[PDB]
RNA sequence: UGCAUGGUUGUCGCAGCUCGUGCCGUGAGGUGAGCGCCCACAUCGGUAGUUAC
RNA sequence: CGGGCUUGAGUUCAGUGGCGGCAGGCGGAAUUCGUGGUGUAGCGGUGAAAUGCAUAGAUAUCACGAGGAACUCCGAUGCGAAGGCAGCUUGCCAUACUGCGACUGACACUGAAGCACGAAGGCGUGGGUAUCAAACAGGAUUAGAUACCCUGGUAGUCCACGCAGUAAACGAUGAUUACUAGGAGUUUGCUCAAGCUUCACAGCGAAAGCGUUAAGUAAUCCACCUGGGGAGUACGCCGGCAACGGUGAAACUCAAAGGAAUUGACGGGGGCCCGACAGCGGAGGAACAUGUGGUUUAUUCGAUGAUAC
């Protein structure tokens with residue numbers, strides 16, 4: 001269960017299935033909102049629970065809705081076994 | 096530290112640096 | 123001739139307007155007393171009675 | 176001129192250092208590309224969008240292979256003549272501070288010419304080339320946008336050697352020596368001495384302010400200034416592949432140009448408070464009444480953003 005977030009969008013991939021705020025319907029000034037992340041999490045969890053697999057979290061980016069997505073994924077079907085942060089730059093490339 | 100003192104010096108540097116570019120590649 | 127005036131008027135639209143001491147500054151400057159009600163409408167209680175009741 | 180002295184200066188020894196210089200090795204995170212698993216309706220970006228990538232198979236995600244650049248936390252302090260110096264380790268250098276009962280005996284300071292070093296950007300030859308990114312291209316906003324915002328993108332940014340010699344190269348404060356009050360911290364060597372920064376006596380200053388790291392008191396040498404433009408321009412000369420650097424006028428023109436502080440006014444600078452920002456009925460459309468403006472003929476005169484009509 002990998003949640004890739006940013007300042008503009010939040011997407012979720014389980015592996016098998018994936019979801020995103022843009023796929024759910026939110027376009028601008030709403031993809032980085034608690035509602036859209038939970039909606040995308042529910043959209044992915046509808047197939048996650050109906051898959052025979054019941055997981056660890058790999059949240060990567062900083063954004064508003066990671067908690068909502070994790071809570072929705074735990075509530076629907078399987079439960080979040082462990083939320084291990086994988087947020088990753090020891091003075092690397094110039095931005 | 097009035098500020099207008101440096102504006103005249105900045106402005107004449109612009110005229111000097113622009114005047115040389117008009118004939119740089121112009122043989 | 124209201125761009126010569128008096129007296130009146132409208133706006134600013136208003137909460138801060140003055141009188142003295144000391145002290146600070148080379149200077150331009152800073153910082154104890156005077157001032158911010160009335161009229162009408164409601165209830166009740168004493169006197170008046172016509173061209174009023 | 177001829178001798179002496181050790182306090183200045185230097186040499187030796189011991190202790191204590193250090194993002195000081197040069198050179199050789201070693202590293203993990205992130206990130207780029209190529210090749211393969213999973214998987215499919217979008218991703219990205221913005222104030223909102225679009226240009227862009229993507230079902231002849233994206234974003235995401237798991238691997239293998241090939242590379243380039245920068246060194247998170249420590250981390251604010253320390254070093255260097257300055258410019259500057261920060262992953263780990265080693266080698267070779269330089270240098271500083273403190274002391275000795277070791278040495279020599281004024282061997283010192285400064286320094287026009289000259290020489291050396293000297294950020295970034297730039298130039299030449301050979302490598303390399305991931306990110307970012309002048310110029311350039313497209314998309315937006317605007318009356319226009321040759322900009323600010325977004326997407327691409329070549330020099331350059333990296334390495335070696337050689338040019339170039341500039342900066343708000345600033346503490347806008349040259350070097351050396353001696354002396355003169357207190358508070359608050361900090362580092363190292365041990366209450367003491369070096370260094371490191373802000374309040375602050377005397378004094379200085381036009382004031383802001385400086386004040387043992389002076390802009391205080393004094394002495395030595397060097398650099399520079401003599402109102403503002405013209406102008407760091409023109410000519411000549413020297414240097415450089417070029418870019419350009421150095422030296423550096425006059426004619427003419429003006430009565431100013433400036434510094435520090437004070438009171439207002441203003442701010443698409445902030446703060447603190449107190450009232451304009453849910454309902455109802457009109458005007459703006461029609462016909463008349465009325466008052467003005469305009470034109471006409473004599474259409475008396477005045478009132479003309481809010482505050483005339």
Ligand SMILES: [K+]
Nearest residue numbers: 374375384385
């Ligand atoms: K002071």
Ligand SMILES: [K+]
Nearest residue numbers: 298299416417
């Ligand atoms: K060249």
